[PDB]
Design an enzyme around this catalytic site. Structure first.
Site, mmCIF file in Angstrom:
data_model
loop_
_atom_site.group_PDB
_atom_site.id
_atom_site.type_symbol
_atom_site.label_atom_id
_atom_site.label_comp_id
_atom_site.label_asym_id
_atom_site.label_seq_id
_atom_site.Cartn_x
_atom_site.Cartn_y
_atom_site.Cartn_z
ATOM 1 N N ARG A 255 0.888 -1.191 0.000
ATOM 2 C CA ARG A 255 0.000 0.000 0.000
ATOM 3 C C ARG A 255 0.914 1.226 0.000
ATOM 4 N NH1 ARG A 255 -2.961 0.276 4.647
ATOM 5 N NH2 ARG A 255 -4.562 1.870 5.008
ATOM 6 N N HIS A 356 -1.850 14.157 17.067
ATOM 7 C CA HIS A 356 -2.796 13.465 16.166
ATOM 8 C C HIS A 356 -3.955 12.873 16.962
ATOM 9 C CE1 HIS A 356 -4.387 10.590 13.193
ATOM 10 N NE2 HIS A 356 -4.435 9.771 14.217
ATOM 11 N N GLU A 357 -3.736 12.368 18.181
ATOM 12 C CA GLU A 357 -4.829 11.683 18.924
ATOM 13 C C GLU A 357 -5.426 12.612 19.973
ATOM 14 O OE1 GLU A 357 -4.459 7.250 18.596
ATOM 15 O OE2 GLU A 357 -5.289 8.643 17.115
ATOM 16 N N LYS A 463 -3.308 -3.128 -12.847
ATOM 17 C CA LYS A 463 -2.151 -3.044 -11.926
ATOM 18 C C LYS A 463 -0.972 -2.517 -12.744
ATOM 19 C CE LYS A 463 -1.874 -4.266 -7.477
ATOM 20 N NZ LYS A 463 -1.834 -5.746 -7.482
ATOM 21 N N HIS A 487 -8.161 -5.328 5.404
ATOM 22 C CA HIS A 487 -9.414 -4.759 4.853
ATOM 23 C C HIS A 487 -10.106 -5.749 3.914
ATOM 24 C CE1 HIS A 487 -7.789 -0.452 5.730
ATOM 25 N NE2 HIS A 487 -7.071 -1.346 6.367
#
Lengths: 597, 196
Positions: A255, A356-357, A463, A487
């Protein structure tokens, strides 16, 4: 003749007898995640189930009010949900078979071990070993043996298993009025009846194909770079004009491309600034990382962190043998109960995490004044985005400087900017091309544009095409190359990651102008402004009450995603990115196959 | 006076009466109401302010009234399973004339349905606040005492504490023994003021 009002009440109860059930179901979960035991698991098995009870029944007593008469959208919405029977409506004996499927695959992927290709001993398990094997060495072989160690293997286990869910999943949908699961999946954005702010359930598809066919120019030159800088560290292999094969790329499936800053480094003679050291020098402790965050937010004039945070948040490792799950994750058990659970390890890869959190908690504190069934985010990816913009302004050669942390002795130059980018542009521009495909394929496969006996073809077709990768080895129709990652095998829509990457730059360039920028935008830093401060809250407040379409206008300034802003962040780079190619080639020669050779 | 003998009383808004002079002047008589409520509602309880607390559970008027006193009680009132004891009336039928009161459980209905209602709901007005100790400071239990004074035809009897000054004796001094006034030297005596 109250068709409504005879329901503005139905909600008034729900809104009270739910929160209480939800509090005592999110609590349970902290306790486990914090303290890992057995009774705790069970202790959550009950309330982590109970909630369910409440739900189902209320849906029953929710269609009892034909939405048709409702006109106050506020209630047309709080109802929009509840009713949604979704599954359950699906056949029984069949609903069973589905419940089954998931498990099988959703499990397979988990323990999936890869025994050595030269011994039943090196049976690497993904988490540690399969992965390393990919984002680690450089030598060929093991990279293929690994791209081989899963596809025609840990996925074949589910090859027909994927072909399974696609059957029932589409059934359910049909019923609930949704051509394909993808038409169900393509809904979080469907905005109906709002005059001008309206949005469809398909319009999306096109806005994507538009925004994307604008990016190619950038991405094109990036596979152009590596393609050659992957002809140096490599011998007769990467045809100089074809596609970067799999295995030799980055992660496992690939990814992101992040695991590469080495091989490609603009000027590998630059400092790569890292404040880690200095943290260990001022003796910066953990409760500092968070007090810093808190400030950034209060500086720009936003609520301080409550007292239930600093007194109930697991802000370090799992105490003693208190086995804990170490996943940074801000919670919201409701009733003002906000908590964070990250095992902050002193460094500059955790100081950004905090910023970020905490944004997650700072949004979750504005929508806190809305009906329980309307407390979330306008659309799927407004939640990350509104807390990544923070891990962007946090690590600014300025902030870290102006924050008594980063040696103000910053000998800042061009070959560092030119260099901090290939990093923030190998994991936010090399991920884009991949987020499309997957979605396309399934969005199609679902709709039924491909017949199983071809599914495979497309993958590889789309691809070498959209992305630029060729199958290291030729692959068989009975391999679920697509379905071989969390996922894919855990039913998760994966477009919240293409719309979060394009709403972050539309938010940066907007709450930037407000604080008076004027130079490279990567240099932005809203810290200490207050004009942008209000800019955000006027959106973080509407929770899910109003359409996402208009939520933007409050901020940004329009109402449809834009690839322009993003193509400005790295605009600097797109210069040295053409002068570095100069005479080398650009574009892929689809034909060349390192296997079809 | 021992009213300051409470914590930082989260409130004390003396709408109507000068907060000060509280002990300086007297009125016919004063009632003191009281109840437990979440802290996200300790404002509804105020002249004019609207909402659920003031709608089916306790509506003040606008008249001075006197004052109000609020303190967080979690410490002792809250629990750890849900102090499911304090209750409220989500819905009555209309509203209440300042200082009314209704306790009849009366399962709510209305709707001319087989169970006159709002879609198989037949809701019941009484709901349980259910506090816990980890909640916010807006869902935690606060305590309230509403001070209602009044000045009818007869006097301010209740009235308040007055101070002395100690006796002097052998020196012009103005005075106010009991309620008689005047100016004179207050020497000893030799009389036998009968026991009354």
């Amino acid at each position: 003749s109250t068709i409504e009002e005879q329901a503005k009440t139905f909600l008034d109860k729900f809104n009270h007898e739910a929160e209480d059930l939800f509090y005592q179901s999110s609590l349970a979960s902290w306790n486990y995640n914090t303290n890992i035991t057995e009774e705790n698991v069970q202790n959550m098995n009950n309330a982590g189930d109970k909630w369910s009870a409440f739900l189902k029944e209320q849906s029953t007593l929710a269609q009892m009010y034909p939405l048709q008469e409702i006109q106050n959208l506020t209630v047309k919405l709080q109802l929009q949900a509840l009713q949604q029977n979704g599954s359950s409506v699906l056949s029984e004996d069949k609903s069973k078979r589905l419940n089954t499927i998931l498990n099988t695959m959703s499990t397979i992927y988990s323990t999936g071990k890869v025994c050595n290709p030269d011994n039943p001993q090196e049976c690497l398990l993904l988490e540690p070993g399969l992965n390393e094997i990919m984002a680690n060495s450089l030598d060929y072989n093991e990279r293929l043996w690994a791209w081989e160690s899963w596809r025609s293997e840990v996925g074949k286990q589910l090859r027909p298993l994927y072909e399974e869910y696609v059957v029932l999943k589409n059934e359910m949908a049909r019923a609930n009025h949704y051509e394909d699961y993808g038409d169900y999946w393509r809904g979080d954005y469907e905005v109906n009846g709002v005059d001008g702010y309206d949005y469809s359930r398909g319009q999306l598809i096109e806005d994507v194909e538009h925004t994307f066919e604008e990016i190619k120019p950038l991405y094109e030159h990036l596979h152009a770079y590596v393609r050659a800088k992957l002809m140096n560290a490599y011998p007769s292999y990467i045809s100089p004009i074809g596609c970067l094969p799999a295995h030799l790329l980055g992660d496992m499936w690939g990814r992101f491309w992040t695991n590469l800053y080495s091989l490609t480094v603009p000027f590998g003679q630059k400092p790569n600034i890292d404040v880690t050291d200095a943290m260990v020098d001022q003796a910066w402790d953990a409760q500092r990382i968070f007090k810093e965050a808190e400030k950034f937010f209060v500086s720009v004039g936003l609520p301080n962190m409550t007292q239930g945070f600093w007194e109930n948040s697991m802000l370090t490792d799992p105490g003693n043998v208190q086995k804990a799950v170490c996943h940074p994750t801000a919670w919201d058990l409701g009733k003002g109960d906000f908590r964070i659970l990250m095992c902050t390890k002193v460094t500059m890869d955790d100081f950004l995490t905090a910023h970020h959190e905490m944004g997650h908690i700072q949004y979750d504190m504005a929508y806190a004044a809305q009906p329980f069934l309307l407390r979330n985010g306008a659309n799927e990816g407004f939640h990350e985005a509104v807390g990544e913009i923070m891990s962007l302004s946090a690590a600014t050669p300025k902030h870290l400087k102006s924050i008594g942390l980063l040696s103000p002795d910053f000998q800042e130059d061009n070959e560092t900017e030119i260099n901090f980018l290939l990093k923030q542009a190998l994991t936010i521009v090399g991920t884009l091309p991949f987020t499309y495909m997957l979605e396309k394929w399934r969005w199609m496969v679902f709709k039924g544009e491909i017949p199983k006996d071809q599914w495979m073809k497309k993958w590889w077709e789309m691809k070498r095409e959209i992305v630029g990768v060729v199958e290291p080895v030729p692959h068989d129709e009975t391999y679920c190359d697509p379905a071989s990652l969390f996922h894919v095998s855990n039913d998760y829509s994966f477009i919240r990651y293409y719309t979060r990457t394009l709403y972050q730059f539309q938010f940066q360039e907007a709450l930037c102008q407000a604080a008076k920028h004027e130079g490279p935008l990567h240099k932005c830093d809203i810290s200490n402004s207050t004009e942008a401060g209000q800019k955000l809250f006027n959106m973080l407040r509407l929770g899910k009450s109003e359409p996402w379409t208009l939520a933007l206008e409050n901020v940004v300034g329009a109402k449809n995603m834009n690839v322009r802003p993003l193509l400005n962040y790295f605009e600097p780079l797109f210069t040295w990115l053409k002068d570095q190619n100069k005479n080398s080639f650009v574009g892929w020669s689809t034909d060349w196959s390192p296997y079809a050779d | 006076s021992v009213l300051y003998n409470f914590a930082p009383f989260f409130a004390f808004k003396c709408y109507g009466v000068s907060p000060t002079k509280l002990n300086d002047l007297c009125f016919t008589n004063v009632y003191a109401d009281s109840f437990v409520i979440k802290g996200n509602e300790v404002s509804q309880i105020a002249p004019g302010q609207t909402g659920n607390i003031a709608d089916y559970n306790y509506k003040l008027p606008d008249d001075f009234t006197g004052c109000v006193i609020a303190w967080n009680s979690n410490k002792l009132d809250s629990k750890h399973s849900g102090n499911y004891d304090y209750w409220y009336r989500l819905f009555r039928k209309s509203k209440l004339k300042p200082f009314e009161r209704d306790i009849s459980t009366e399962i709510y209905q209305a709707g001319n349905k087989p169970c006159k209602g709002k879609g198989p709901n037949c809701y019941f007005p009484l709901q349980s606040y259910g506090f816990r100790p980890t909640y916010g400071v807006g869902h935690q239990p606060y305590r309230v005492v509403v001070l209602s004074f009044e000045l009818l035809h007869a006097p301010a009897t209740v009235c308040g504490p007055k101070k002395s000054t100690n006796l002097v004796k052998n020196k012009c001094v103005n005075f106010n023994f009991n309620g008689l006034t005047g100016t004179g030297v207050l020497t000893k005596s030799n009389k036998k003021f009968l026991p009354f």
